[PDB]
Amino acid sequence: AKNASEVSELLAKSLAEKAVVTEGGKVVEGFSYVSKAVAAKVIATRRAEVHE
Amino acid sequence: EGNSVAGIIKSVNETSGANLLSSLKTIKAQAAPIYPAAASSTGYSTQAK
Structure with a gap:
């Protein structure tokens, strides 16, 4: 439960991507x-690449 | 022995941009002409003798 924030943003990021x-x-x-x-x-x- | 400008062109074209300006003195010295150093003397050769 102290990485619940990270699994929540992981759900939101996997839905957003x-x-x-x-x-x-x-x-x-x-x-x-x-x-x-x-x-x-x-x-x-x-x-x-054009500059190099 | 190919000509040193094509050596410069090849040695510049196959270098990444991260290590171009570091590698520039190496390509400058790879294509500088050979000035042979002063070898050991062993003086008074057979025709001088």
């Missing part, structure tokens, strides 16, 4: 999205 999308409440079948942190990581690796 597999977050699905809904259009009108109906779940969209087969929807893949590239985030803004993912796109900025792609930009940063590309900038780093």
Whole structure:
């Protein structure tokens, strides 16, 4: 019970990382999205390799 | 013995960016020309004698 906080944030993080999308409440079948942190990581690796 | 500029080009291209500026004096000294050092004398050769 003194790692109940960590198992609670682990449930919330595991639910948030597999977050699905809904259009009108109906779940969209087969929807893949590239985030803004993912796109900025792609930009940063590309900038780093062109700078080297 | 290939030419030292292609050696510089190859030795710069296959180095990561983390250890590029550390490795630059090694590539500078790998492609500096050979100036042979002063060997031991053994003077007065056969034609001088």
